[PDB]
Write a protein that binds this DNA or RNA. Sequence first.
RNA 1: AUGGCUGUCGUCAGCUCGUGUUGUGAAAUGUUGGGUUAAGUCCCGCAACGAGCGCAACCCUUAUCCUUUGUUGCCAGCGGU
Length: 225
Amino acid sequence: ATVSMRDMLKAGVHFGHQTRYWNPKMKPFIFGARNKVHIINLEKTVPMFNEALAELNKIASRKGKILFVGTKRAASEAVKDAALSCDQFFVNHRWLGGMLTNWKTVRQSIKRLKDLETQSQDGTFDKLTKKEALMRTRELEKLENSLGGIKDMGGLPDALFVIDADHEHIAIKEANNLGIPVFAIVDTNSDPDGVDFVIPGNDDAIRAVTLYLGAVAATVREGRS
RNA sequence: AUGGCUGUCGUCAGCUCGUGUUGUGAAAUGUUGGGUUAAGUCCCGCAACGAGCGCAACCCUUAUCCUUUGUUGCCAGCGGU
């Protein structure tokens, strides 16, 4: 149920950014620098990866709801195959400022989505002209482009999973406000203090983000069972 | 001292609210930015997300055809003048 260090070496989890963009709040997780490129200290990560999954074992056991957040085009596709396979919720596109704290408004937009979603099945657009139908599908697709992965959310999620916290610092501000356990994949240039469960790793690699997703996929399915 | 009614900026495209967020606060954000339009009209980005009054549309007239009717209106196809 846990990953080995050998597989992570092939995954490229320790290939951080340069020594010019590094964040000084990551010193306890910085190994060295080769060709002026910081290496993630893998010794601290592996044990912290398990307790991160251990926390995932507890929340998923009590019918908990988790949220995978990643707005990078080099990670936007993996999260789609992740949440849909493990029966969860995700946000691959633009993280709206106010998805959590301003839920009383995003709740109605979901009703607006489901209003146009229900209108798309029966075919109500066939009696309206081409102008009214195209207009109702240009927003319906935009809400699918925004709230498409959280249509059946049902209230505030109980856990937050983030990919590269510094690129998602809007989501962490909302997570620390409501008191939600946030599990983030922090990079050498990212923000560690905002997240209580930090997982020092890389974000600009395809195989790196999937190795995390493969691990979190099984542990949450262990909670559903 | 007022109601109702009116002129003008101006038919200019702006004016605001609920929630969230930012700053001790007045307030800001939304309404900024790249393009675009007659126009905060529309798309994309974006700590903003939505909505309301406005703009637009629905109203009237004019322009083309068809259907319905033919008076006191009209006169082509046929006669008497």
